[PDB]
Structure formats: C-alpha cells, structure tokens
Amino acid sequence: GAGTEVQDALERALPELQQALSALKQAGGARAVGAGLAEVFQLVEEAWLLPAVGREVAQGLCDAIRLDGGLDLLLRLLQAPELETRVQAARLLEQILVAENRDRVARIGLGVILNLAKEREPVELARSVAGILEHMFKHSEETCQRLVAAGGLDAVLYWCRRTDPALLRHCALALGNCALHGGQAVQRRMVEKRAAEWLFPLAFSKEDELLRLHACLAVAVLATNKEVEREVERSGTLALVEPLVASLDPGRFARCLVGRGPDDLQRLVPLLDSNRLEAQCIGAFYLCAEAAIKSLQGKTKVFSDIGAIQSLKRLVSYSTNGTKSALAKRALRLLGEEVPRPILPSVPSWKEAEVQTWLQQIGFSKYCESFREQQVDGDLLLRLTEEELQTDLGMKSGITRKRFFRELTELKTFANYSTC
Amino acid sequence: TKVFSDIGAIQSLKRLVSYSTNGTKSALAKRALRLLGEEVPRPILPSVPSWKEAEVQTWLQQIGFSKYCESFREQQVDGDLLLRLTEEELQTDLGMKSGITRKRFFRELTELKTFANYSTCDRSNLADWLGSLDPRFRQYTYGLVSCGLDRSLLHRVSEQQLLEDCGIHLGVHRARILTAAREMLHSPLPCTTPDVFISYRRNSGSQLASLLKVHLQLHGFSVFIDVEKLEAGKFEDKLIQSVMGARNFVLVLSPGALDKCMQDHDCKDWVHKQIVTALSCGKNIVPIIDGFEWPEPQVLPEDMQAVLTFNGIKWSHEYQEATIEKIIRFLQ
Amino acid sequence: DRSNLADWLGSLDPRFRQYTYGLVSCGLDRSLLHRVSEQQLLEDCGIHLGVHRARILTAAREMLHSPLPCTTPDVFISYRRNSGSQLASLLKVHLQLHGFSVFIDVEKLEAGKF
Amino acid sequence: VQRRMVEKRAAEWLFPLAFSKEDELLRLHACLAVAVLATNKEVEREVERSGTLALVEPLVASLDPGRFARCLVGRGPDDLQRLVPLLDSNRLEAQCIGAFYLCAEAAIKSLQGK
C-alpha cells in the first residue's frame, strides 16, 4: 500500500522535525528562532506540496508538532515582541491547523491570537493571522461566539479595505466559514456589523475569480437567514450572484481543487432547499464541482446519503432559471442521474400521463399503478384529499400522506392557473 | 466500570455532548465516555428543520431508540416530518404501542426542539419570544411557524387553533401563551432613486469604487453603482437616467481612466458619456484623486473637459474614515 | 419547583402535597396559580377529586387577593495576585454581606485584554 | 471446455510455469488457472493427480497482496464476480488464491474508494 510510502517520507521528515524543535529551543534574538521556523515551514510545505499522497504526510507532521512541542511553543513565540518571530510563527500555524490543532489552540490560547488581531499593519503578518482565524472559525459555535465578543470579527472586516490577494481571499473565506459555522445569533452579529456591506468590495473584484466566488457563497448562506434576509437584500449584494455563476464554470475550478467531506458538503444542501435564487445557484455550482471531483475519485455515494439528489430533482422540476437548471443538470449527469423533464405548469390540464410522470418525479412511482387505476388527472389530482388517499389509494401511512401533500402544495405553489 | 450503567449517568453523558455547546463540558464528557469505553456520539445537527432521513436515523440511535430506526427509514421521517410527529402517528403507524414509550420519546423530542435551531423557518424569532416567556416554551417554535404565524400576527390566535393547528396540549400553556399574546398587542404593539452615482474605470478604480459604495451606504447615501459587467447590451440607456437620478456624482480618478476618454468626440466611451450627461444636468460632481495624474484640457473632448474644474479629492487608503467624512462634507 | 408550591399545598392541606409535581409539570408556580381554570386542573394537572379542585382553586383566588404576588461597582478590589488574595476575598465577603457593590479582579490570568 | 483442457494435459503444462524461478506474476496467474480448474469436480481428480495444486499455498504465503496490487496501479464488476466461486469451493487452493486476488483488488478499490 501507499501507507508504507507515507511512513517512508515520515521517517525522513520526523528527524528534520527534531532538528527544528532543537533549533527552536535556543531563545535566539531573531536569527536561530526564525531560521528554525522558516525551515520547518518548508518541511511541511513540500509535505502539502507533495505531488504523491502527501496530505496525510502533512497531517502526521502537524500531529508530531502537537505531540512534540505542541502549539504552546508557537503561542509563546507569538507573544515575543519581535515582529519577524511573530510573522514566521504565524506562517507555521497557518499550515498546521488540523481539527485537533484547532481544538488545542482554541482551548489553550485563542485569546493570544485575539491579542494579535488588534495589530494589523504588516500585510505578511495580517495574511497569516487571517488564515489562522479562518481555520479557527471552522471549529465550534462557542469558539465563533468568543471570536465575536472579541474583535475576531472586527479584524476580518477592517481587512476588507486593503489589497493583498491572499489576505482578501482569507477574509472572504473566513467570514464564509463563520456564517456557515457561527450560529443564529452569530449571523445576527455579522449583519449588525455591516457584514454584507463589506463582502461587497470583494465579490465585485476585477482581480480574482475564486475570491468573488467564495465571497458570494458567503452572502448566499447568509440568505438562509430570514431574520437578516431583509438586510442582506438591502445591502445590494445578492445581485452579483447569478451573473457571476453564469460567467464561470463548475469544472474549470473543480480542477482548481484537484474537495469537501461528508459534513462540509451537507452544510450546503440547505442552500438548495431555500426560497431564494442566490442560494440555489451557488449551491448547484459548488455541488457540480464536487460532483465532478467525487466522480473522478468515484466517491459518488455521499451525495445520496446527504440527499441533495432529491433537491437536484427539484431545482429542475419546478425550476425556471436557465443557469440554475443548467448547473443542476450538469451535476445530475456528472453523478449520472436521471434528469427529469421540466414538468407542465398547466397543472389543471394534466392528463393521466403527466400525472404518472410526476408521480415518478417525486419518488412516488410506487403509486403510479394505483393512480392510473383511479384515472388521476390535472383536476382529480389538485382536489385529492386525506380520506381519498389513505382509503382508496391505499397510501396507508399518513406520514406518507403528510409528505405527499407537502410536495403537492409546492407543486400548486408552482402551478399555473391561466385556464381556471 | 459497571456501576455507572446502573446509576445510568451514561445516558446523561450521551446528552452533555449531543445537545452540548460547551467545550470544556464536552471534552470532559468525551473523556469519561472513553475511559468507560463508550460510543461517543457526534454533536447532532442544530438545523433540525433540515434533517434528512440520515440524521433522523443517527438521532434515533443517539437516544437508544435505534430499535425504531427501521420503522422510520420506512416512513421517510425527515427534519420536517419529525418535528410534526404526533400521538396517533407514532402509536399507530410507527408501531410505538407503548404510550410510556411515546411519553418518553416526546420528552426527548421536546428537549431536542428546546435545542433546535430555526434560522431557516422562523422569520421574526418566535423562538426567543417563546423562550423569553418560558425557557421551555421554545418547544413549539416549529409547531407555530408551520402555521404562517409570527410575532405580528400572534395577537389574534384562538385557543382552539393552538390546540388543533399548533398541536400544543398543555391547556395551561395555551392560556399562558394566549395571555402573553393579548399583551404583545397592548404594550409592544407590532405596528406597520439615487443620491449618488458612481463613475469608475471598468477595471482600475473598480476596487476603490466598491469601497466608496460601502462607505456611503453605511452612512445612508442612496448610491448607484454600474453593476453591469458587460458595459454592453442597452448602450448607455438606463445608466444615463440613473445619472439623472443622482443629485451627487462620484468619480474615482484611478490611473488609466481618462486616456480612453481622450478625443472620444463620438461619445462612445460610457464613462465619457456619463461625464457629459452628469455635467449637463448640473449634478454635484465629485472627482476623487487616487493615483491619477491630471491630463490636458484640449486632449479631452470639450463635452467632458469641465470635470477639471471640479475639486479633486485625494484618497487615503489608511484614513479612509476621515477621507469619507471629508467626502460626505461635499455631498448634497 | 421554583417557589415551593410544595409547602403551599402543604400549608393548605397536609395531603395536598401529593400534586406538587402534578403541577410544576405545567409551568405553574405561586405567582401564576391565580388564573388556572378548574378544567385545566382536571385535564393537565391530573387531579380528580373535584372537591380538591374547588378547594385549591378557591385558595388561589385568595392568593391573588391578600398575598397578591407582585412583580456598576461601589467598591473596587486591588490585590496582589497571590499574597493578599485570601484577605481580598475576605473583604469581598464582608462588604457584600453589608450591601456594597464590590468588584474583584476575578481573572486568574492577569492577561488577555491587557 | 474445461473437460477439453484437462483431457489435453492442461495442468501438466501449467506446471513448468507456476514453478518458475523467474517471474512472480507468471506463477501467480499460472496458479490462479489451476485454482479455478479446481472448481471443476469432474476433473478435480485429474488436476490433483497432475501434482500441481501443491505449489499454490506455499506461493500465496510467499508473496504479498499489496506488493502486486500496486503492480496493477484492477477488475470490473464481472471479472471479480467470476472469482467468488473460488472462495465458496471445497478446496484449499481456490480459497487461498481467491482471498489473495480479492485482497489486492480490495486495496485498489479502497484506494479509488469503490
């Protein structure tokens, strides 16, 4: 297996990590410390930059740094009043924040980081600080809330008036991870601090493409917050979403990844079941990119259990948006799934045929027989009832009935009536 | 390691994590769970509205009701059909024949709702309102908002409806909420064009233009930005009207903006076009120097040379706040 | 319980105590007992002796009548982080027991927000 | 067809090949051959008399699944299924070679995640 090869690369790097750890123990003014930092940075850099299976190599490296020297070492280096020390150490952090690294650095010394945020002048420093927070806003709602009480939100917002590419990429990605990982009152805090009004200069850039894309994923998941929905819209930012999604391509940046796990994907399907245009389009976009990637790897099963496939059968069935429908179909075919036809809006005039078609298009094809028996058509459908279903159509589970009526409503919600 | 089971804290230790939110608490709980060598459950999903059948099964296990996971995957119980589960539904269709079971399942279901998030479904936080009423009134947030009700409309519900539609059964709670509502009506009665146009180089000043937009909007200034990324389609049709609608006219003097406006006597340059129309309508024109060097008058077409007469404002990328208050002093 | 519906039912009748949980499992307390219906006490609170129902209820409408249930620092503590800490806590206790809004440097870090 | 094979001394010519001191995949596949043959009871008695199934278990012991699973990067949903009958047989050789190839393809399909 390749695991032996990863162990091989480790048997090389771990000694280098010991050399570094040694080099860090001597409290050099700015020379030996910085040297050790810079080198161990490259050691884990080529680990991430390992063209072979090198992800888990870097994971083992950060594991060793946590089990040998921990983070508290680096934490104290962050309180060393010398800039360069802080900067380099922060760079190191920026590459070592694994989930467990996040847990530790949170529990022990996130407040130190919070002290680093108050100072923002060195663009190289600020870049690192931003990325660190970005990874940290992925940890826990409590962690976020703490970052919110602290100027852990003020800093990323102050940093939206500068021009560093990686910095702004960090800030956008950060606030996006925040909103998706903050919590109800947290999104509140976001908008109440003019969050969208500072996601604006970034999604609007003529400079970077992933910058705007993520910067719009942010406002998009925000749109899942009805409570601030009205303020988000008033910011004048959700306009930029659909044009941009139209502009770019799923695959062209799916290959800029090679993406997510079974939980960073699932935190997005709620973007597809929303009521708003922006959430649907960005959701279909990211889902199409990850569908291409997971089909390349062949891991096309996760989507089913998280179940976006059903939604992808709805952002077309009752769709009306071209870009939305196109991206949805593209993800459906990259997942190799039955693209349904756009159903007929003149639901009054549905004959038994489209009744059967529709019955399938909701995964209730299991009843198509019963309905073709009872001649359910565009009228007898819309006036279906409880006793009718449960008794004559044998749908014995109200839990079924409760669901069928749900979809039936959404259908009517789409249904046209110019005939009746 | 057997005493804990019979005293039964293990169940609690599966709850000081499941609906946990405290890091130290959760950590110590997991540590005890592993020292007892017990299945640490995952922190369940707060967006209970959006629970698919999967997490429904996961949760069903995480309460020791995995014995029903089969029945629920059969009935497609999800983040909605779950929250609206009822007595007859459970006992009859889901075969949970013991009410003593049902009484317990509903107990946990309540605690779940007590934790459940609703940022997708509520619109005006009936959640915290019920919460501020009673810390355990939160258990009917979805029970309500599944009936088109909110703050502003709670004041006219009947008691009966709250029994029939909202599915609450503790008549005491019914009277309590209702009385709270008629008071919500009484003391906290829920009652019922541009000013600034942005002209900017399509690439260079775009960044700073967005910055100015943000600033002035945060200061309450109706600002119009050239949202279009094409500079095409309707060639100078609606944007000119937007110019006419903005009393104040903002222009970012970015490097390389005016050289494509020089000697465009054909009025082809959209920026130039906006310059001419804003000049003609006598708007409050605001040019903003940032890295741009002043050109010759004659090299510009006469219809746009008038901008050189207005005050140039240099932008400080540091004192952007002071730069913006200075900018605001010029507005009308 | 939060406000001892227990002893209240007790002071009413030594064997009325048998519905404490029967009540507080319905969000009721002292201050809110005065507006329960009889029916609720049959349906929600699950008591069945209608005599007891009338008796409690009558007691409540009286609870409303005679015993109607109605609705920054002054002192800062500076102390050595280790030496005076004990005596500082003592002073805190004393002055609080005397009704003095006292602020103690609760933080054990002397760090964070400097 | 397997009849025709053995009747033409098939195993007796799979012998010089699974016995090679030269190639490792050569013998391995050369033994997979006699192994699936062993699923033929009708010739089972002749296969055994050829004196070839002896070499199977020693060889399987010698080599490794992964070391040659990486010599692939394997099969599809039908070139795999034509082998599980090697695991449900009654004989030692079929079981061992079947578990071997299955372990290699399990490593590969886990690498891909399939």
Tab-separated table of C-alpha atoms in Angstrom, chain A residues 48-343:
chain	number	residue	atom	x	y	z
A	48	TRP	CA	1.439	19.776	1.383
A	49	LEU	CA	3.196	20.334	-1.956
A	50	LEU	CA	3.883	16.601	-2.194
A	51	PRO	CA	2.594	15.559	-5.651
A	52	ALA	CA	2.209	11.995	-4.383
A	53	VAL	CA	-0.118	11.205	-1.483
A	54	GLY	CA	1.197	13.973	0.755
A	55	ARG	CA	-1.886	15.265	2.528
A	56	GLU	CA	-1.666	12.605	5.236
A	57	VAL	CA	2.083	13.252	5.375
A	58	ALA	CA	1.448	16.829	6.467
A	59	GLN	CA	-1.288	15.566	8.802
A	60	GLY	CA	1.249	13.326	10.512
A	61	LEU	CA	3.674	16.246	10.631
A	62	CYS	CA	1.222	18.543	12.406
A	63	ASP	CA	0.355	15.559	14.615
A	64	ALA	CA	4.004	15.289	15.630
A	65	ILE	CA	4.242	19.027	16.287
A	66	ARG	CA	1.208	18.710	18.553
A	67	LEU	CA	2.626	15.645	20.326
A	68	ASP	CA	6.125	17.176	20.319
A	69	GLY	CA	6.271	20.840	21.286
A	70	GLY	CA	2.524	21.225	20.898
A	71	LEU	CA	1.299	24.648	19.881
A	72	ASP	CA	2.072	26.432	23.161
A	73	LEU	CA	5.623	26.780	21.865
A	74	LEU	CA	4.413	28.746	18.867
A	75	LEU	CA	1.876	30.509	21.083
A	76	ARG	CA	4.638	31.966	23.239
A	77	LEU	CA	6.561	32.835	20.080
A	78	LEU	CA	3.515	34.922	19.147
A	79	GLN	CA	3.973	36.970	22.322
A	80	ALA	CA	7.657	37.581	21.612
A	81	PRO	CA	7.733	41.364	20.969
A	82	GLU	CA	9.768	40.859	17.772
A	83	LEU	CA	7.754	41.116	14.563
A	84	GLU	CA	9.612	38.629	12.357
A	85	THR	CA	9.314	35.944	15.022
A	86	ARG	CA	5.563	36.502	15.231
A	87	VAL	CA	5.225	36.591	11.447
A	88	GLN	CA	7.120	33.387	10.727
A	89	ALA	CA	5.500	31.526	13.619
A	90	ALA	CA	2.081	32.604	12.369
A	91	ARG	CA	3.002	31.264	8.940
A	92	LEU	CA	3.781	27.936	10.587
A	93	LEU	CA	0.419	27.946	12.348
A	94	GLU	CA	-1.341	28.723	9.082
A	95	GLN	CA	-0.234	25.356	7.693
A	96	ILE	CA	-0.661	23.171	10.792
A	97	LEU	CA	-4.249	23.839	11.910
A	98	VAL	CA	-5.741	20.362	11.729
A	99	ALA	CA	-9.035	19.738	13.541
A	100	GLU	CA	-7.158	18.659	16.662
A	101	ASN	CA	-4.745	21.567	16.270
A	102	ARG	CA	-7.840	23.772	16.230
A	103	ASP	CA	-9.215	22.136	19.385
A	104	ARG	CA	-5.964	22.673	21.257
A	105	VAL	CA	-5.175	26.213	20.095
A	106	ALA	CA	-8.760	27.113	20.946
A	107	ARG	CA	-8.738	25.645	24.456
A	108	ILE	CA	-5.329	26.978	25.413
A	109	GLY	CA	-4.530	30.236	23.689
A	110	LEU	CA	-7.056	31.639	21.248
A	111	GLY	CA	-7.038	34.793	23.378
A	112	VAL	CA	-3.415	35.304	22.410
A	113	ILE	CA	-4.486	35.242	18.764
A	114	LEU	CA	-7.198	37.730	19.685
A	115	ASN	CA	-4.416	39.932	21.016
A	116	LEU	CA	-2.618	39.625	17.686
A	117	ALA	CA	-5.667	40.867	15.791
A	118	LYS	CA	-5.540	44.347	17.329
A	119	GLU	CA	-2.375	44.985	15.299
A	120	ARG	CA	-2.882	44.890	11.545
A	121	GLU	CA	-0.123	46.832	9.728
A	122	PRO	CA	2.247	44.076	8.494
A	123	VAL	CA	0.472	42.662	5.462
A	124	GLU	CA	2.551	39.489	5.743
A	125	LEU	CA	1.584	39.142	9.394
A	126	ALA	CA	-2.069	40.002	8.751
A	127	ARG	CA	-2.203	37.395	5.974
A	128	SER	CA	-1.198	34.659	8.388
A	129	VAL	CA	-3.471	35.939	11.163
A	130	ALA	CA	-6.389	35.929	8.734
A	131	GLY	CA	-5.809	32.357	7.619
A	132	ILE	CA	-5.403	31.206	11.211
A	133	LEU	CA	-8.736	32.717	12.191
A	134	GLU	CA	-10.230	31.279	9.007
A	135	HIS	CA	-9.292	27.791	10.088
A	136	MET	CA	-10.436	28.574	13.626
A	137	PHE	CA	-13.885	29.810	12.623
A	138	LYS	CA	-14.331	26.218	11.433
A	139	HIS	CA	-14.098	24.827	14.968
A	140	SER	CA	-17.188	25.403	17.100
A	141	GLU	CA	-20.039	27.824	17.636
A	142	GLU	CA	-18.710	28.575	21.106
A	143	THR	CA	-15.362	29.360	19.520
A	144	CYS	CA	-17.060	31.625	16.991
A	145	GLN	CA	-19.159	33.444	19.593
A	146	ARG	CA	-15.959	34.040	21.531
A	147	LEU	CA	-14.343	35.411	18.386
A	148	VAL	CA	-17.435	37.605	18.034
A	149	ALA	CA	-17.337	39.076	21.525
A	150	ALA	CA	-13.667	39.664	20.802
A	151	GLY	CA	-12.584	41.703	17.822
A	152	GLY	CA	-12.259	38.421	15.960
A	153	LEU	CA	-14.939	39.725	13.675
A	154	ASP	CA	-13.831	43.355	13.704
A	155	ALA	CA	-10.390	42.427	12.364
A	156	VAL	CA	-11.531	40.449	9.318
A	157	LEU	CA	-13.821	43.360	8.452
A	158	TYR	CA	-11.118	46.003	8.880
A	159	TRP	CA	-9.070	43.907	6.465
A	160	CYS	CA	-11.524	44.369	3.615
A	161	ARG	CA	-10.153	47.831	2.778
A	162	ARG	CA	-6.724	46.515	1.741
A	163	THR	CA	-5.444	44.980	-1.475
A	164	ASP	CA	-3.393	41.884	-0.637
A	165	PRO	CA	-4.717	38.991	-2.756
A	166	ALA	CA	-4.157	36.211	-0.246
A	167	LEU	CA	-5.346	38.468	2.578
A	168	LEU	CA	-8.692	39.209	0.981
A	169	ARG	CA	-9.054	35.582	-0.077
A	170	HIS	CA	-8.534	34.718	3.574
A	171	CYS	CA	-11.013	37.317	4.830
A	172	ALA	CA	-13.736	36.215	2.433
A	173	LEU	CA	-13.185	32.531	3.111
A	174	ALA	CA	-13.112	33.341	6.832
A	175	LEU	CA	-16.420	35.170	7.082
A	176	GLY	CA	-17.962	32.488	4.902
A	177	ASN	CA	-16.815	29.754	7.245
A	178	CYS	CA	-18.043	31.985	10.051
A	179	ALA	CA	-21.594	32.345	8.769
A	180	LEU	CA	-21.782	28.671	7.892
A	181	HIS	CA	-20.349	27.874	11.325
A	182	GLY	CA	-21.345	30.747	13.593
A	183	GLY	CA	-24.944	30.235	14.634
A	184	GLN	CA	-28.212	32.110	14.708
A	185	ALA	CA	-27.180	34.969	16.985
A	186	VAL	CA	-23.805	34.927	15.267
A	187	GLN	CA	-25.184	35.686	11.809
A	188	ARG	CA	-27.134	38.358	13.641
A	189	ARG	CA	-23.867	39.812	14.930
A	190	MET	CA	-22.455	39.567	11.417
A	191	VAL	CA	-25.113	41.613	9.658
A	192	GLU	CA	-25.401	44.008	12.586
A	193	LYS	CA	-21.757	44.849	11.939
A	194	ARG	CA	-22.423	45.513	8.231
A	195	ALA	CA	-21.115	42.139	7.077
A	196	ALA	CA	-22.634	42.078	3.588
A	197	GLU	CA	-21.671	45.720	3.122
A	198	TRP	CA	-18.081	44.541	3.431
A	199	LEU	CA	-18.457	41.345	1.443
A	200	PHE	CA	-19.313	43.781	-1.362
A	201	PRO	CA	-15.865	45.102	-2.437
A	202	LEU	CA	-14.653	41.523	-2.659
A	203	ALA	CA	-17.257	39.663	-4.680
A	204	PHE	CA	-17.079	42.679	-7.017
A	205	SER	CA	-13.366	42.342	-7.786
A	206	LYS	CA	-11.904	42.541	-11.272
A	207	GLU	CA	-8.902	40.691	-9.857
A	208	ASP	CA	-9.565	37.145	-8.624
A	209	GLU	CA	-12.175	34.578	-9.582
A	210	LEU	CA	-12.218	32.305	-6.527
A	211	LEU	CA	-12.221	35.442	-4.398
A	212	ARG	CA	-15.595	36.641	-5.661
A	213	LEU	CA	-16.923	33.093	-5.841
A	214	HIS	CA	-16.324	32.360	-2.183
A	215	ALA	CA	-17.255	35.943	-1.274
A	216	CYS	CA	-20.660	35.216	-2.811
A	217	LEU	CA	-21.015	31.796	-1.235
A	218	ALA	CA	-20.842	33.817	1.977
A	219	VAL	CA	-23.767	36.136	1.267
A	220	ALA	CA	-25.562	33.117	-0.177
A	221	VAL	CA	-25.551	31.086	3.022
A	222	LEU	CA	-26.443	34.329	4.747
A	223	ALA	CA	-29.595	34.385	2.649
A	224	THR	CA	-30.664	31.257	4.502
A	225	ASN	CA	-31.165	33.602	7.475
A	226	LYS	CA	-34.630	35.044	7.043
A	227	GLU	CA	-34.092	37.239	10.090
A	228	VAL	CA	-31.384	39.169	8.254
A	229	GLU	CA	-32.614	38.350	4.751
A	230	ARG	CA	-34.223	41.778	4.507
A	231	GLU	CA	-30.973	43.485	5.496
A	232	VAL	CA	-28.840	41.351	3.210
A	233	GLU	CA	-31.030	42.324	0.275
A	234	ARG	CA	-30.895	45.976	1.281
A	235	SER	CA	-27.097	45.777	1.148
A	236	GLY	CA	-27.360	45.433	-2.611
A	237	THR	CA	-25.090	42.416	-2.880
A	238	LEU	CA	-27.093	39.353	-3.925
A	239	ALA	CA	-27.379	40.928	-7.378
A	240	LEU	CA	-23.811	39.967	-8.258
A	241	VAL	CA	-24.502	36.276	-7.628
A	242	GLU	CA	-26.353	34.887	-10.638
A	243	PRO	CA	-24.333	36.862	-13.243
A	244	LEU	CA	-21.104	35.554	-11.771
A	245	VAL	CA	-22.348	31.959	-11.548
A	246	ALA	CA	-23.304	32.312	-15.200
A	247	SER	CA	-19.847	33.657	-16.035
A	248	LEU	CA	-17.687	30.863	-14.661
A	249	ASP	CA	-17.712	27.082	-14.993
A	250	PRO	CA	-18.046	24.259	-12.456
A	251	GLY	CA	-15.274	22.077	-13.835
A	252	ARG	CA	-12.786	24.866	-14.550
A	253	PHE	CA	-12.495	25.395	-10.794
A	254	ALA	CA	-13.307	21.870	-9.683
A	255	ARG	CA	-9.865	21.235	-11.197
A	256	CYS	CA	-8.598	24.209	-9.170
A	257	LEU	CA	-9.325	21.960	-6.191
A	258	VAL	CA	-7.652	18.872	-7.656
A	259	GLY	CA	-12.877	18.811	-2.204
A	260	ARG	CA	-15.103	18.554	0.866
A	261	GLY	CA	-16.045	15.845	3.329
A	262	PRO	CA	-19.387	14.323	4.324
A	263	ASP	CA	-20.056	17.334	6.549
A	264	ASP	CA	-18.721	20.355	4.658
A	265	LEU	CA	-20.956	19.196	1.826
A	266	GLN	CA	-24.071	18.638	3.977
A	267	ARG	CA	-23.732	22.185	5.349
A	268	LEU	CA	-24.684	23.327	1.844
A	269	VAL	CA	-27.788	21.359	0.756
A	270	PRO	CA	-29.814	23.801	2.892
A	271	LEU	CA	-28.645	26.303	0.300
A	272	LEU	CA	-30.534	24.316	-2.314
A	273	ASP	CA	-33.786	23.984	-0.342
A	274	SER	CA	-34.036	27.709	0.383
A	275	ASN	CA	-36.573	30.071	-1.133
A	276	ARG	CA	-34.112	32.411	-2.817
A	277	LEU	CA	-32.370	32.464	-6.188
A	278	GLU	CA	-28.825	33.107	-4.984
A	279	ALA	CA	-28.654	30.151	-2.624
A	280	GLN	CA	-29.938	27.781	-5.298
A	281	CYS	CA	-27.464	28.890	-7.954
A	282	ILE	CA	-24.326	28.925	-5.811
A	283	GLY	CA	-25.407	25.635	-4.267
A	284	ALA	CA	-25.790	23.936	-7.630
A	285	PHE	CA	-22.413	25.384	-8.654
A	286	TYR	CA	-20.368	24.062	-5.734
A	287	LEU	CA	-22.301	20.805	-5.857
A	288	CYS	CA	-21.440	20.405	-9.545
A	289	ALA	CA	-17.741	20.987	-8.873
A	290	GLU	CA	-17.698	18.465	-6.033
A	291	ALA	CA	-19.740	16.064	-8.176
A	292	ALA	CA	-17.039	16.206	-10.850
A	293	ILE	CA	-14.331	15.618	-8.224
A	294	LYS	CA	-16.132	12.803	-6.389
A	295	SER	CA	-16.878	11.176	-9.740
A	296	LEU	CA	-13.211	11.448	-10.699
A	297	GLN	CA	-12.424	9.648	-7.452
A	298	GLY	CA	-15.586	7.590	-7.885
A	299	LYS	CA	-16.934	8.532	-4.454
A	300	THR	CA	-20.351	9.351	-5.888
A	301	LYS	CA	-22.241	7.875	-2.912
A	302	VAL	CA	-22.003	10.695	-0.341
A	303	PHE	CA	-24.450	12.921	-2.223
A	304	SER	CA	-27.160	10.261	-1.966
A	305	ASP	CA	-26.996	9.934	1.812
A	306	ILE	CA	-26.856	13.700	2.297
A	307	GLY	CA	-29.628	13.543	-0.271
A	308	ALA	CA	-29.117	16.657	-2.398
A	309	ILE	CA	-30.073	14.439	-5.354
A	310	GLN	CA	-33.718	14.904	-4.461
A	311	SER	CA	-33.204	18.671	-4.364
A	312	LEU	CA	-31.390	18.408	-7.680
A	313	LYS	CA	-34.578	16.792	-8.961
A	314	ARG	CA	-36.420	19.858	-7.754
A	315	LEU	CA	-34.170	22.696	-8.873
A	316	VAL	CA	-35.166	21.460	-12.322
A	317	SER	CA	-38.702	20.109	-11.952
A	318	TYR	CA	-40.159	23.375	-10.657
A	319	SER	CA	-37.174	25.361	-11.910
A	320	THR	CA	-37.497	28.451	-14.011
A	321	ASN	CA	-33.902	29.691	-14.093
A	322	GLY	CA	-31.664	28.799	-17.014
A	323	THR	CA	-28.276	28.965	-15.333
A	324	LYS	CA	-29.725	27.213	-12.298
A	325	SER	CA	-31.313	24.471	-14.392
A	326	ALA	CA	-28.156	24.011	-16.463
A	327	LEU	CA	-25.865	23.620	-13.462
A	328	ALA	CA	-28.373	21.269	-11.863
A	329	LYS	CA	-28.498	19.055	-14.949
A	330	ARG	CA	-24.702	19.120	-15.164
A	331	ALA	CA	-24.346	17.890	-11.597
A	332	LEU	CA	-27.066	15.311	-12.253
A	333	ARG	CA	-25.173	13.884	-15.222
A	334	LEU	CA	-21.766	14.046	-13.551
A	335	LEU	CA	-23.467	11.994	-10.839
A	336	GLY	CA	-25.019	10.087	-13.732
A	337	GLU	CA	-28.593	10.514	-12.586
A	338	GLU	CA	-31.928	10.655	-14.382
A	339	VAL	CA	-32.518	14.277	-15.353
A	340	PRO	CA	-36.299	14.756	-15.163
A	341	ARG	CA	-38.198	16.790	-17.618
A	342	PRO	CA	-39.430	20.273	-16.695
A	343	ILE	CA	-42.973	19.444	-15.683
